[PDB]
Amino acid sequence: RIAEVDARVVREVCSKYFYDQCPAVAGFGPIEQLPDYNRIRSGMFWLRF
Amino acid sequence: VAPTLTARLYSLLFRRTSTFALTIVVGALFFERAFDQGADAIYEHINEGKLWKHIKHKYEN
Amino acid sequence: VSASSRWLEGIRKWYYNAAGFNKLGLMRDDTIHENDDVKEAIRRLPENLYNDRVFRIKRALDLSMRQQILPKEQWTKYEEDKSYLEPYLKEVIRERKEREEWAKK
Amino acid sequence: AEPEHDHRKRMGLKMLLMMGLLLPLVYAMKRHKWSVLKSRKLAYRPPK
Amino acid sequence: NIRKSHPLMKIVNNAFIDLPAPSNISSWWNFGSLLGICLILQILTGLFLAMHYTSDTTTAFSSVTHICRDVNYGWIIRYMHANGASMFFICLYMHVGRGLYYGSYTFLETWNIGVILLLTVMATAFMGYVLPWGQMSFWGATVITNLLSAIPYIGTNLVEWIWGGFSVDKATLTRFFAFHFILPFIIMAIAMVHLLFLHETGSNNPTGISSDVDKIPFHPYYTIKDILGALLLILALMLLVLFAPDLLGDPDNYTPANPLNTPPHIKPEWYFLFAYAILRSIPNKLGGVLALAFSILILALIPLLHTSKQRSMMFRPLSQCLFWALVADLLTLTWIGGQPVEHPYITIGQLASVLYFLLILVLMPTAGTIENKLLKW
Amino acid sequence: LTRFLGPRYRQLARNWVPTASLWGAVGAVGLVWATDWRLILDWVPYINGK
Amino acid sequence: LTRFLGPRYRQLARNWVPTASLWGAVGAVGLVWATDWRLILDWVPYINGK
Ligand SMILES: CCCCCCCCCCCCCCCC(=O)OC[C@H](COP(=O)(O)OCCN)OC(=O)CCCCCCCCCCCCCCC
Ligand SMILES: CCCCCCCCCCCCCCCCCC(=O)OC[C@H](COP(=O)(O)OCCN)OC(=O)CCCCCCCCCCCCC
Ligand SMILES: CCCCCCCCCCCCCC(=O)OC[C@H](COP(=O)(O)OCC[N+](C)(C)C)OC(=O)CCCCCCCCCCCCC
Ligand code: HEM
Ligand code: HEM
Ligand SMILES: CCCCCC(=O)OC[C@H](COP(=O)([O-])OCCN)OC(=O)CCCCC
Ligand SMILES: CCCCCC(=O)OC[C@H](COP(=O)([O-])OCCN)OC(=O)CCCCC
Ligand SMILES: CCCCCC(=O)OC[C@H](COP(=O)([O-])OCCN)OC(=O)CCCCC
Ligand SMILES: CSC1=N[C@@](C)(c2ccccc2)C(=O)N1Nc1ccccc1
Ligand SMILES: [Cl-]
C-alpha cells in the first residue's frame, strides 16, 4: 500500500482533505497573535492555483 | 444522492482559482450582451415611439 | 440622613440608568478616559480586579459590535457599582501633585 | 441645454439595476466574513 | 513571508492588512476611506477635465460647454467632478461629527492636522468653482477675495496682490486654475501624514474605551466593510450625476461672468452656507470676517474644552442633546445662508449664530462638568 | 544559472503547467472582452450583435 | 494648569527674558528688512536712498 504512493497520489489525496476545507483550531496560552479564523481559512487555498 | 447544482458547480469551476477566474471573465462576456440587450429593451419600451430609433422609418427618403 | 439628599440620589440613579453603560454590564470606573494617571492606577490593580476589568470591557465591546445589550437582569445595579479604581487613582494624583509642588520650590 | 438627457436616463436605469444586484451581494459578502465574529461566544473562567 | 519584510509592502501591510483595529467601529468610521475615494475620484475626473479645459475668460466658459457637448462622455466626467466635490463635503462633515460625538479629537496631532485638511479642501473647491467662469463663479469669487481687505493696514495690498490687478479678472482665473490643480496633491500628502499619526495610536471606537483587549485585523473585516461603504458612496454620487445633476448647482452659473452687475441674490454651494450666515450676522466688515474665521478655527480648540472624565458621548445623555442642538443649529445657519438678508432671516441668523459659539464654548464644556458630578467624580 | 534543470525541477514544471495555461485563458479572454476584439468575437455564436 | 507659577518658574522666566526680547529684535528687524517697510527705514540714516 506504500509503494503504490507516488507524487500524483499525495497531491490527489492531500487536496481531497486539505485544499479549501474548513479546519478546526484550538489555542491555549499567549495567543494574541493567533491569526483570525478567516485568515486561517484563507490559508487553506492559493489564489495562484 | 446526486449532488445539487451548487455542489457540482464548486467541484468543476470554483475549487481551482484559475477556473474560478476563467468563468468570471467568461461570465462577464455573456452577462454584458444579455444585460445591455435586455436593459435597452426596457428603456425604449417605456419610451416607445418617442425617440429617433422609432421614427427613423418616416424620413428614410 | 434626610429626604432632600435622598432624591439627590434618585436623580443620580436616574442619570446612571440613562447613561446606560450598566446596560453593557459595565461599571463607572470601566469608562474612565485613560490618561497617564489612569494608566498608572490600572497598572496598580491586583490581578483579580484587572482581569475582571478586562473581561467586562471585552464583553461590552462584543455587545457594542452587535448593537445589543444584556438582559435587564444582568445590568449593573447603581447600588452595586464598586468604585474600585478611584482609591488607586486618587493616590496617583496625590503623588503627582506632590511632585508638582516640589517642582516650583 | 441638455442634449445628454436621454442617454443619461438610459445609463441611470442600468445603474439602478446593477446596484440592486451588487448592493445585496456585497452586503452578503460582508455578512459572510463577519459571521465568525457576530456569533462568537465568550466565557470568563478565572482561577478560584 | 514576503508581505512582512519587503520594505515597500511592509508599509502597506501595517496600514491595510495586519493593522489591529477595534472590533466595534460603526458605519461612522467608514468615512475616512470614503474621503480617500472621493479624493481619488476628484483627481481622475479632475485630470480628464483638465485635458479639454482652457484657462482664459474668453473661452473658459465655452471650454466647459465643449466638454458637456462634444467630447465623448465628458458631461458625465464633469458632473462626477462637480457632484464628487459635494460628496467630498458630505463625508468631511460626517468625519468631523464622528470625531466630536465620540471624542476622537483627543488624538491632538491627528485632529489638529485634520483641521488643516478641512481648510485646504475648502480652498480647493473654492478655486474649482471659479474655473467655469459663470456669474456665481465670478461674484462668489469677488465676495471671498475681498475678505482680506478687512485686515487693517495691509488689507488692500494683499487683495490686489492676490488679484494681479484691481479686480478678479484674467490673471486670477489663470492662477486659480494652477492652484486648483496642485492643491489636491498637497492634500494627498497631508492625508498620508493624517494616517501616520493615526497609526501611532490606532482607532477610537463608539464607547471611548480602549479596545486593546479585543482587536481584529483590518483585513478581511474592514476591507469588505469599506468596499460596501464605497459602493454606497458610488450610489449616492451616481444618483446625483444621472438623475439630478443641477440640484445643487445654481442656475445663474450657466450665464457667462459679467463684471458689471450682480444677481439680486447670491448663495454659495450648500457646504459653505452655514459659514456665510455667520459672516452676515454682524453689521461690521472686520467683525464679520473674524467671526467667519473663528467659525472653522473653533475646531482647533475643541480638545482644550474637554471636561468629561469619559471620552465618548455614548454614555453622556446631557452632552448628546447639546450635540444635536448643534447639528440643528448648524442646519439652521445653512438655511439662513441660502436666504436673502431680510426680515426675519436676519435676526434668526444672529440667534443661531450665537447658539453655535455658545454651545461649543460654554454649554458643552459646562455640560460635561455637570455629568461628572452626577457620576460622583 | 543551471541550478533549475534536473529531475525535481521538470516535475515542478509539469505540476504547474495545467494552471499557467488556464491563467493564459483568463488573460487572453480578458484581453478580448475588455478591448472588444471583433476578429475573435464573431465565431462565438451568441454575442454576435450590435 | 497652575503648575507653572511658583518660585522656580518665575526664576526661569527672568533667566530667558533677555533672550526672547532679542529674538523679537531678530524677527522685527527681519520683518522690516524683508518687506522694505519704509515707515521705519526713514529715520535710520544710511539706508535712506532709492
Ligand atoms: C484610466 C481609467 C480611469 C477610470 C477612473 C474611474 C473613476 C471611478 C468612478 C466610478 C463610477 C461608477 C460607474 C459610472 C458609469 C456608468 O454609469 O456606466 C453606464 C454603463 C452603460 O453605459 P451605455 O449604455 O452608455 O453603454 C453600454 C455599452 N455596452 O453601465 C452601467 O450602468 C454600469 C454601472 C453599474 C453601477 C456602478 C457600480 C460601481 C462598481 C465599482 C466600479 C469602479 C471601477 C473603478 C476603476 C478605476
Ligand atoms: C460644519 C459643517 C456644517 C454643515 C451643515 C450640514 C447639515 C446637517 C444635516 C443633518 C444630517 C444628520 C445625519 C443623521 C444622524 C442620525 C444619528 C442616529 O440615528 O443615532 C444617534 C447615535 C447614538 O448611538 P451611540 O453611539 O450613542 O450608541 C449606540 C448604541 N446602540 O449617535 C451618533 O451616531 C452620532 C455620530 C455623529 C453624527 C454626524 C452628523 C453631524 C454633521 C455636522 C457636524 C459638524 C460640527 C462642527
Ligand atoms: C487587459 C485586460 C485584462 C482583463 C482581465 C479580466 C479579469 C477579471 C477578474 C478575475 C479574477 C478573479 C480572482 C478571484 O476571484 O480571487 C479574488 C478574490 C477571492 O475570493 P474568495 O471567495 O475570497 O476566494 C475564492 C477561493 N476559490 C477560488 C478557491 C473559490 O475574489 C474576491 O474576493 C473579489 C470580490 C470583490 C471585488 C471588488 C473589488 C473592487 C474595489 C471596490 C469597488 C467599489 C468602489 C471603488
Ligand atoms: C482630506 C481630508 C481627510 C481624509 C482623507 C481623512 C481620512 C481619515 C481616515 C482614513 C481615518 C481613519 C479611518 C476612519 O476613522 O474613518 C481618519 C481618522 C481621523 N480623522 Fe480624518 N480625514 C480627513 C480629514 C479630517 C478632518 C477634517 C478632521 C477633523 C477636523 C479629521 C480628524 C480625524 C480624527 C480625529 C480621526 C481619528 C478617528 C478615530 O480613529 O476614531 N480628519 N481620517
Ligand atoms: C479634492 C479635490 C477636488 C475638488 C473638491 C474639486 C472641486 C471642483 C469643483 C466644485 C469644481 C466646479 C465644477 C463646476 O462648477 O462645473 C471644479 C472644477 C474643475 N476642476 Fe476640480 N476639484 C478637485 C480636484 C481637481 C484636480 C486634481 C484637477 C486637475 C488635475 C481638477 C480640475 C478641474 C477643472 C479643469 C475644473 C473646471 C471644469 C469644470 O468646471 O467642470 N480638479 N473642481
Ligand atoms: C485583479 C484581482 C485582484 C485580487 C485581490 C485579492 O484577492 O486580495 C485578497 C482577498 C481574498 O483573498 P484572501 O484574503 O482569502 O487570501 C487568500 C490567501 N490564500 O480579496 C480581497 O478581499 C481584497 C480587496 C481589494 C480591493 C482593492
Ligand atoms: C495595449 C492597449 C490596446 C488598445 C486597443 C484599442 O484601443 O482598441 C482597438 C481594437 C478593436 O478591435 P477591432 O476588431 O476593431 O480591430 C481593429 C484593428 N485595428 O482592439 C484590439 O485589437 C485589442 C489588441 C490588444 C493588443 C495588446
Ligand atoms: C504678511 C505678509 C506681508 C505683505 C506686505 C507687502 O506686500 O508689502 C507692503 C508694505 C510696504 O511698505 P510701505 O512703507 O509702502 O507701507 C505700505 C502700507 N500699505 O510692507 C509692509 O508694510 C509689511 C507689513 C507686515 C505685517 C505682517
Ligand atoms: C468662488 S464662487 C464659490 N465657490 C464655492 C464653491 C466655495 C466658497 C468658499 C469655500 C469653498 C467653496 C461657493 O460656494 N461659491 N459661491 C459663492 C457665492 C457667494 C459667496 C461666496 C461664494
Ligand atoms: Cl456651463
User: Which residues of chain A have a CB within 8 Å of the CB of B15?
Assistant: 19-20
Residues 73-102 of C with CB under 8 A from G: 100
Cα–ligand 8 centroid distance for E155 (angstroms) = 10
For chain B, give the number of residues.
61
Task: Please check whether residue E81 is in contact with residue E73, taking contact to mean a CB–CB distance below 8 angstroms.
Answer: no
Q: Which atom of ligand 4 is nearest to the CA of E32?
A: 16
The Cα of A8 is separated from the nearest Cα of chain F by a number of Å equal to: 9
Distance CA E149, CA E144 (A): 10
Asked whether C and D share 3 or more beta-carbon pairs under 8 angstroms, the answer is yes
**Candidate from B16, B25, B29 with C-beta closest to F47:** B29
Distance CA E244, CA B20 (A): 39
Place of cell 511632585: C99
**Helix H segments across A1-49?**
7-17, 37-42
Distance CA E238, CA D6 (A): 16
Domain boundaries, chain G: 1-50
- SS3 of chain E: the string is CHHHCCHHHHHHHHHHHCCEEECCCCHHHCHHHHHHHHHHHHHHHHHHHHCCCCCCHHHHHHHHHHHHHCCCCHHHHHHHHHHHHHHHHHHHHHHHHHHHHCCHHHCHHHHHHHHHHHHHHHHHHHHHHCCCCEHHHHHHHHHHHHHHHHCCCCHHHHHHHHHCCCCCCHHHHHHHHHHHHHHHHHHHHHHHHHHHHHHCCCCCCCCCCCCCCCEEEHHHHHHHHHHHHHHHHHHHHHHHHHHCCCCCCCHHHHCECCCCCCCCCCCCCHHHHHHHHHHHCCCCHHHHHHHHHHHHHHHHHCHHHCCCCCCCHHHCHHHHHHHHHHHHHHHHHHHHHCCCCCCCHHHHHHHHHHHHHHHHHHHHHHHHHHHHHHCCC
Q: CA quadruple E198, E200, E205, E208: dihedral positive or negative?
A: negative
The Cα of E241 is separated from the nearest Cα of chain D by a number of Å equal to: 8
- Domain housing D38: 4-48
Place of cell 452587535: C66
Which amino acid, residue G36? D
Task: Please check whether residue E331 is in contact with residue C32, taking contact to mean a CB–CB distance below 8 angstroms.
Answer: no
Q: Which three cell numbers stand for residue E366?
A: 459646562
Task: Please check whether residue D28 is in contact with residue E225, taking contact to mean a CB–CB distance below 8 angstroms.
Answer: no
| Strand (E) or helix (H) holding A3 | none
Task: Please check whether residue E369 is in contact with residue E307, taking contact to mean a CB–CB distance below 8 angstroms.
Answer: yes
**What does DSSP assign to residue C93?**
H
List C-alpha distances in Å: D1 to E69, E255, E343. 9, 12, 36
Q: Which residues contact D26 (CB under 8 A, 6 or more apart)?
A: E224, E227, E228, E231
Q: Do A48 and F19 touch (CB under 8 A)?
A: yes
Best mutation site among F35, F36, F42, F50 for ligand 7 pocket (most ligand atoms within 8 Å of CB): F35
Which amino acid, residue F11? Q
List C-alpha distances in Å: E343 to E336, E346, E352. 11, 6, 15
Q: Give the chain C residue whose CA is nearest to the CA of G10.
A: C104
Q: Which three cell numbers stand for residue E72?
A: 465623448
Distance CA C103, CA G2 (A): 12
Torsion angles phi and psi, residue E139, rounded to 5: -80, -30
Q: Do D38 and C62 touch (CB under 8 A)?
A: no
| Cβ(B40) – ligand 1 distance below 6 Å | no
Task: Please check whether residue E168 is in contact with residue E142, taking contact to mean a CB–CB distance below 8 angstroms.
Answer: yes
**Cα E311–chain centre separation:** 24
**What does DSSP assign to residue D2?**
-
DSSP string, B34-55: HHHHHHHHHHHHHTTTSSHHHH
Would you please indicate which residues of E are annotated as catalytic (active-site) residues? 199, 203, 225-226, 269
| Cβ(F34) – ligand 7 distance below 6 Å | no
Distance CA F40, CA F22 (A): 18
CATH code of E150's domain: 1.20.810.10
Distance CA F46, CA B35 (A): 13
Distance CA E250, CA E266 (A): 9
CATH code of D8's domain: 1.20.5.100
Which amino acid, residue E231? L
Distance CA E85, CA E237 (A): 10
Torsion angles phi and psi, residue E86, rounded to 5: -70, -40
Q: How many C-beta atoms lie closer than 10 Å to residue A4's C-beta?
A: 6
| Helix, strand counts (H, E) of chain F | 2, 0
Task: Please check whether residue E348 is in contact with residue E336, taking contact to mean a CB–CB distance below 8 angstroms.
Answer: yes
Q: Which residues contact E338 (CB under 8 A, 6 or more apart)?
A: E267, E270, E273
Q: Which three cell numbers stand for residue G5?
A: 507659577
Distance CA E24, CA E206 (A): 7
The Cα of B27 is separated from the nearest Cα of chain A by a number of Å equal to: 19
Q: Which residues of F5-42 are buried (b: 16+ CB within 10 A; e: fewer)?
A: eeeeeeeeeeeeeebeebbebbeebbebbeeeeeeeee
The answer to whether D9 contacts chain B (CB < 8 Å) is: yes
Cα–ligand 7 centroid distance for F36 (angstroms) = 7
Q: Give the chain D residue whose CA is nearest to the CA of B37.
A: D14
Place of cell 499525495: A10
Task: Please check whether residue E258 is in contact with residue E135, taking contact to mean a CB–CB distance below 8 angstroms.
Answer: yes
| Ligand with minimal distance to E265 CA | 9
The answer to whether A32 contacts chain D (CB < 8 Å) is: no
Burial group, residue A39, by CB count within 10 angstroms (0-12, 13-18, 19+):
middle
The Cα of G14 is separated from the nearest Cα of chain C by a number of Å equal to: 14
| Cβ(E321) – ligand 2 distance below 6 Å | no
User: Which residues of chain A have a CB within 8 Å of the CB of E219?
Assistant: 39
Torsion angles phi and psi, residue C2, rounded to 5: -135, 180
Closest CA to A37 of C88, F30, E157, D38: D38
Known binding residue E199? Answer is: yes
Closest CA to E260 of E374, E167, E353, E370: E167
Task: Please check whether residue E193 is in contact with residue E150, taking contact to mean a CB–CB distance below 8 angstroms.
Answer: no
Q: Supply the angle between the helices E218-243 and D5-38 in degrees, to the nearest 10.
A: 160
How many alpha carbons lie under 13 Å from residue A41 in its C-beta half-sphere? Answer: 11
Closest CA to E52 of E40, E42, E41, E66: E66
Distance CA E162, CA E160 (A): 5
List C-alpha distances in Å: G39 to A35, D37, G42, G44, G47. 71, 71, 6, 11, 13
User: Which residues of chain D have a CB within 8 Å of the CB of C62?
Assistant: 40, 42
Distance CA G10, CA C102 (A): 14
Q: How many C-beta atoms lie closer than 10 Å to residue G49's C-beta?
A: 4
Closest CA to E131 of E44, E64, E231, E83: E64
Cα–ligand 3 centroid distance for B26 (angstroms) = 14
Which residue is closest in CA terms to ligand 9's atom 12?
A: E126
Pairing of strands E20-22, E215-217: antiparallel
Q: Which residues contact E322 (CB under 8 A, 6 or more apart)?
A: E359, E363, E364, E367
Q: Which three cell numbers stand for residue C35?
A: 490618561
Place of cell 495562484: A48
Farthest CA pair distance, chain F? 54
Q: Which three cell numbers stand for residue E343?
A: 426680515
The answer to whether C36 contacts chain G (CB < 8 Å) is: no
The answer to whether C61 contacts chain D (CB < 8 Å) is: no
Torsion angles phi and psi, residue C97, rounded to 5: -60, -35
Q: Give the chain D residue whose CA is nearest to the CA of B31.
A: D18
| Cβ(A47) – ligand 6 distance below 6 Å | yes
Preceding omega of G45 cis (within 30 degrees of 0): no
Q: Which atom of ligand 2 is nearest to the CA of E299?
A: 47
Q: CA quadruple G5, G8, G12, G15: dihedral positive or negative?
A: positive
Contacts of A among chains (3+ CB pairs under 8 A)? B, D, E, F
Radius of gyration of chain F (CA): 18
**What does DSSP assign to residue B15?**
S
Farthest CA pair distance, chain D? 80
Count how many domains chain E has.
Answer: 1
Torsion angles phi and psi, residue E286, rounded to 5: -65, -30
Q: Most D CBs within 10 Å: which of E68, E77, E242, as the mutation test of the D interface?
A: E242
Closest CA to E269 of E94, E141, E117, E111: E141
SS3 category, C57? helix
For chain F, give the number of residues.
50
The answer to whether E244 contacts chain D (CB < 8 Å) is: no
**Residue E375 — left, alpha, or beta (φ > 0 → left; ψ -120 to 50 → alpha)?**
alpha
User: Which residues of chain D have a CB within 8 Å of the CB of A37?
Assistant: 36
Distance CA B29, CA F28 (A): 13
Domains for chain C: give ranges and CATH numbers: 1-105 (1.10.1090.10)
Q: Which three cell numbers stand for residue E150?
A: 478687512
- SS3 of D7-44: the string is HHHHHHHHHHHHHHHHHHHHHHHHHHHHHHHHCCCCCC
Closest CA to E95 of E31, E167, E164, E15: E31
DSSP string, chain F: -GGG-SHHHHHHHHHHHHHHHHHHHHHHHHHHHHHT-HHHHTTSSTT---
The Cα of D24 is separated from the nearest Cα of chain A by a number of Å equal to: 21
Cα–ligand 6 centroid distance for E224 (angstroms) = 10
Q: Do E217 and A42 touch (CB under 8 A)?
A: no
Distance CA E244, CA D5 (A): 11
Q: List the beta bridge partners of residue E223.
A: none
Asked whether D and G share 3 or more beta-carbon pairs under 8 angstroms, the answer is no
**What does DSSP assign to residue C79?**
G
DSSP string, G1-50: -GGG-SHHHHHHHHHHHHHHHHHHHHHHHHHHHHHT-HHHHTTSSTT---
**What does DSSP assign to residue C76?**
P
SS3 category, F4? helix
List C-alpha distances in Å: E254 to C98, D18, E250, E251. 69, 33, 8, 6
Place of cell 516640589: C102
Distance CA C32, CA C45 (A): 15
In chain B the first and final C-alpha atoms are separated, in Å, by: 66
Which amino acid, residue E37? I
Q: CA quadruple C32, C37, C40, C45: dihedral positive or negative?
A: negative
Cα–ligand 3 centroid distance for B13 (angstroms) = 15
SS3 category, F7? helix
User: Which residues of chain D have a CB within 8 Å of the CB of E238?
Assistant: 12, 15, 19
Task: Please check whether residue B22 is in contact with residue F22, taking contact to mean a CB–CB distance below 8 angstroms.
Answer: yes
| Strand (E) or helix (H) holding C5 | helix C4-19
User: Which residues of chain B have a CB within 8 Å of the CB of A20?
Assistant: 15
Task: Please check whether residue E24 is in contact with residue E205, taking contact to mean a CB–CB distance below 8 angstroms.
Answer: yes
SS3 category, B14? helix
Asked whether F and A share 3 or more beta-carbon pairs under 8 angstroms, the answer is yes
User: Which residues of chain E have a CB within 8 Å of the CB of A43?
Assistant: none
Q: Which residues contact E329 (CB under 8 A, 6 or more apart)?
A: E352, E355, E356, E359
Place of cell 496625590: C94
Closest CA to A39 of B22, E105, B33, E17: E17
CATH 3.30.200.100 fits domain F1-50: no
Q: Which residues contact B40 (CB under 8 A, 6 or more apart)?
A: D10
Task: Please check whether residue E150 is in contact with residue E286, taking contact to mean a CB–CB distance below 8 angstroms.
Answer: yes
Distance CA E314, CA A17 (A): 48
Experimental approach was: X-ray
Domains for chain B: give ranges and CATH numbers: 1-61 (1.20.5.260)
| Cβ(E374) – ligand 5 distance below 6 Å | no
| Strand (E) or helix (H) holding B20 | helix B17-46
Task: Please check whether residue E206 is in contact with residue E103, taking contact to mean a CB–CB distance below 8 angstroms.
Answer: no
Closest CA to E377 of E280, E306, E307, E322: E307
List C-alpha distances in Å: A9 to A1, A4, G28. 11, 8, 86
Preceding omega of E344 cis (within 30 degrees of 0): yes
Which residues are placed with Cβ below 5 angstroms of ligand 10, an ion? E 64
Farthest CA pair distance, chain E? 70
Q: How many C-beta atoms lie closer than 10 Å to residue A26's C-beta?
A: 5
Place of cell 459659514: E275
SS3 category, C77? coil
Known binding residue E81? Answer is: yes
Distance CA E304, CA C33 (A): 15
